[PDB]
Design an enzyme around this catalytic site. Structure first.
Site, PDB file in Angstrom:
ATOM      1  CD  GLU A 145      -0.684 -19.668   2.832  1.00  0.00           C
ATOM      2  OE1 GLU A 145       0.231 -18.830   1.465  1.00  0.00           O
ATOM      3  OE2 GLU A 145      -0.239 -20.012   3.681  1.00  0.00           O
ATOM      4  CG  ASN A 162       4.887 -10.436  -0.876  1.00  0.00           C
ATOM      5  OD1 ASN A 162       3.760 -10.600  -0.269  1.00  0.00           O
ATOM      6  ND2 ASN A 162       5.592 -11.904  -0.827  1.00  0.00           N
ATOM      7  CG  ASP A 169       9.350  -9.408   1.427  1.00  0.00           C
ATOM      8  OD1 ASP A 169       8.556  -9.186   0.624  1.00  0.00           O
ATOM      9  OD2 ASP A 169       9.871  -9.415   2.141  1.00  0.00           O
ATOM     10  CB  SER A 216      10.361 -12.025  -1.518  1.00  0.00           C
ATOM     11  OG  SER A 216       9.256 -11.381  -0.497  1.00  0.00           O
ATOM     12  CG  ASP A 265       4.698 -15.311  -0.989  1.00  0.00           C
ATOM     13  OD1 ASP A 265       5.563 -15.520  -0.534  1.00  0.00           O
ATOM     14  OD2 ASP A 265       3.173 -15.048  -0.403  1.00  0.00           O
ATOM     15  CG  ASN A 320       9.085 -14.640   0.729  1.00  0.00           C
ATOM     16  OD1 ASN A 320      10.324 -15.242   0.792  1.00  0.00           O
ATOM     17  ND2 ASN A 320       8.331 -14.047   0.093  1.00  0.00           N
TER      18      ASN A 320
END
Length: 130
Positions: free
Chosen positions: A35, A46, A49, A51, A53, A60
């Site tokens: 990750e 991202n 959309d 969002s 992380d 998220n």
């Protein structure tokens, strides 16, 4: 902070992650490795959309923490996304425990399926004294 492998392994064990909801320590290590490369300040936007992380386990913003700019978001861990960027991972661990309390469990992270599931993950904790 960028953790060294065994340092992180011992930290996670002290925080009660070994066997949490049936998930072994080696699995948590494999997840953090893929990750973020064990990096607590890692962030990934991202664009598709809106969002982002956050942190070592890449939580998220649409589901786990609040950053205020993500549309239709919830804050299941009841934390500011800023807390998931600290050098101290106590809050990140409390949130990871929350994520796996859901039915999907460790599968909630697509990366785990791709890089950890059904594999020999022993190498992640070997020699760490855990």
């Amino acid at each position: 902070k960028v953790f060294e492998r065994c340092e992180l392994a011992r930290t996670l064990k002290r925080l009660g992650m070994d066997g949490y909801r049936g998930i072994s320590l080696a699995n948590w290590m494999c997840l953090a490795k893929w990750e973020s490369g064990y990096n607590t300040r890692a962030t990934n936007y991202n664009a598709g959309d809106r969002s982002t992380d956050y942190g070592i386990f890449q939580y998220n913003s649409r589901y786990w923490c609040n950053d205020g700019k993500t549309p239709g978001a919830v804050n299941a861990c009841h934390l500011s996304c800023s807390a998931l960027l600290q050098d101290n991972i106590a809050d990140a661990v409390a949130c990871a425990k929350r994520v796996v309390r859901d039915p999907q469990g460790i599968r909630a992270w697509v990366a785990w399926r791709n890089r950890c599931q059904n594999r020999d993950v022993r190498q992640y904790v070997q020699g760490c004294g855990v």
